[PDB]
Structures are given as structure tokens and as C-alpha cells.
Amino acid sequence: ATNFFIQPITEEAEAYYPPSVITNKRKDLGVDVYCCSDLVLQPGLNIVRLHIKVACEHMGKKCGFKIMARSSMCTHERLLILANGIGLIDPGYVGELMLKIINLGDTPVQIWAKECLVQLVAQGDHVPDHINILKRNQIFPLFAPT
Amino acid sequence: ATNFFIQPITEEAEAYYPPSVITNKRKDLGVDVYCCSDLVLQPGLNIVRLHIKVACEHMGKKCGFKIMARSSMCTHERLLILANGIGLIDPGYVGELMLKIINLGDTPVQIWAKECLVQLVAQGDHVPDHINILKRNQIFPLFAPT
Amino acid sequence: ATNFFIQPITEEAEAYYPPSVITNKRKDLGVDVYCCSDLVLQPGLNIVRLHIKVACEHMGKKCGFKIMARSSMCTHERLLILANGIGLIDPGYVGELMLKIINLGDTPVQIWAKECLVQLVAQGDHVPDHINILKRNQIFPLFAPT
């Protein structure tokens, strides 16, 4: 079994992430995650807070995951790339997910709160069984540092 | 066992993809795929049709794969990058493979039909046993939607 | 078991890579590797020699690995990206590791010898047990061509 755990850490965030235990019966590799906020991306590098904590589990243990762009992210309307190609998150990290996005255009670019620019892929490309959305207050032992 | 299935969906395509059951005894991760057509890549984003359908199989089931640049793709002659870093293709997709390629240069760039700009890597980085090239007419149950 | 083998192939290199058998008890996916030399990256593509040979082993056999940027690589001070998104190295390759890095800025950029711009991830994202740093002279059968 491979499971994902997402907890919003802001009010606007929990709007887009109502508590559920979503299953993945389509056998989709990637877990889409929302921007949760209208932002303007300037030419060059931008830091985009995702307002969530995330844990991935494989065969009972805490595991790593990768952040990868969706096809949607880069159009003729917005030349956006993930700065580090794909983000690796080690099992040890328990802070907020944050993206480095390069706007390659010479003019600024707007993204909308509902948009999913990236998806989360489990270490080793293991398809997730459930995506557990937790509510803001509930303190998982998974997000405790060590 | 991990096997790949490639079917050309155009005449010029089947030129480069004669029906075979290629084996991979070198233990190469990546399956090189040709452009099949002379194209000119303008500054900014370009959509590059690959004129093939592709299925990947691991342990009997249909599985996902990733599209990754080859070292060849980006030279001093052509600043080309894959727009989404690496393409993830879910098992469910059965249409034509298409690339988003960013020309970072300020002048247009020519690619030739014989050139392999990208390779296909099986979900979980599993080395393929055989690369089955199918012929244009043969209707695999693998490319049937569900 | 998954093990990494790094051998410096220059004197300045062995400075940063003293012979050890480092273990990875943090369960980190990525093996950080140093630039080993002050270089200036011009706008456009740059080739960055890493002055090491590397082998990866999974379950006794020689295996493949991937080169991925660290978060550190791209800042507001330096718009650097890996040109091929992530580097795949086939088990067969036994030469020096070399990076293609795109400086997206319009002015040149300095990197310092101690800096780790990239990390090595084992095929299939398998966490390494030990990182064996070998010394310059010792001829591993792993770096012999076939």
C-alpha cells in the first residue's frame, strides 16, 4: 500500500481541501494540488507557497515524493517551468510545500487559486491507494519532526 | 517483465518504425523515439506530434511511463528543453504522444525526422524486456479506451 | 541493498571526496556531489565536468541512476536549470559525470568549488545504504567497460 496525507495549513487552503479519504481507482500516478491563492508570477524565479503539509507512506513507512509539472502548467499564454525540473521531498521534511517556478516570458503572468500547476508522485512512481485530506487542527504523528 | 508497445499512426511514421519485437539486452532504461518529420521550432513553446501510440506493461498490467529529454536534445546549436521537465503518461491515455518543447533562443531552430530528442522510461524506472513495434493496421486491445 | 560508488579522477576532486564508506541513516534519496572547481557559467548552455566516476548497485547488479537539481541550484541570484530536466545514466556508462546547465540570465554567473548544485538518485528512487567514496588509484571492476 502507498497512501498520501495532505493537510491544509490556512483557511483559504481548507476551502479547496475539505476533509475526505479520496481513493484512486483510476490508477493515476499523480496527485494534483491547487495554488489556493491568486498570484502574479514576475519574469524570472517566483516562490509559490501551496499552503499544505504532505506525507507519503509506502509499505507502512514514511517515504519520499516528487513534485512534477502538469501539462497545463506551460501554455502559449504562460511560459512557466518548475525551476528544479522535479522537486524531491525527503521523508524527513514536514514543513509547507513550496514551488520555485520560472516565468520565461518578459511580461508578468497571473495564476488563479483553483488552478493545479503540479502533481505529487510517490517515490518509485507507486500509484497511491488513498489520498487522505486531513483538517487544519488534527495533529498527525506523520507531521511531527524527528 | 516490463514490455513497451509502439504503433506508428501515419505512413512517414511506419517508415522509422518497421514492425519488430526488438529486445533490450544492453539493459538500457530509455526507449528512444524519432521526430518522424522535419519541423521548425519557434522561440517559445512548440507542440511536437510524435505520430505513435505507446503502451507500457509491468507484471501483466498496463502501466504508466515518463518522457525525458536525451542529452542530444539541448546543444550550443539549439537551446531546447521539455516544457514540463518530464512527461508523465497515465496508463489510461491511448492517444498520440505529443511533446511541449521550449526553444529558449531568440531565433528559430530546425529538427530533422531521424532525430531522437526524447526517450520513454517505464513507471518506476523498470528496464524493458522487449520493445514491440506494431504495424499501422493491427488493433491492440491495449490502445482501446476504458 | 542499494549502494553508490564515487571515485574522484583529479587531485582537486579527491580534496572534496576523501576515501570513506559513508552510510545514509537519514534515509535521504539523493547523493549530493560538489562542483570541485570555481566556474563561470555564461548565458546559454554550459558543460560542467564533475571530476568523478559513479556506479550504482541494486540487489548485486550494476544499475542506472538519475541526476536532479538541488533546490539550491536556482535562486534569484542565478537562474540555473539542468538542460535535460533530469540526467539518466545507463549502467553501461563508466566515464566522468558531466552536466549541461542553462544560465537563463543575460549576465554571467559564478559557482564555487564547495557548492552542490545536483544530487544522484538511484534508478527506481531506491534509498542508498552506503556511499562508497573510493581513492583516485583503486581500479574497481565496476568502472571497467563492457
Numbering used by the authors:
A (entry chain A), B (entry chain A), C (entry chain A): 2 to 147
Manuscript text:
On the one hand, it catalyzes the cleavage of dUTP into dUMP and pyrophosphate (PPi), which reduces the possibility that dUTP will be incorporated into DNA through DNA polymerase. We observe that the swine enzyme employs a classical dUTPase architecture made up of three-subunit active sites, whereas the ASFV enzyme employs a novel two-subunit active site.
ASFV dUTPase (aDUT) gene consists of 495 bp and encodes 165 amino acid residues. The results of gel filtration experiments on the recombinant protein and static light scattering measurements indicated that ASFV dUTPase is in a trimeric conformation, which is consistent with the results of previous studies. The results of the thermofluor assay showed that ASFV dUTPase was denatured when heated to approximately 83 °C, whereas swine dUTPase denatured at 62 °C, indicating that ASFV dUTPase had better thermal stability.
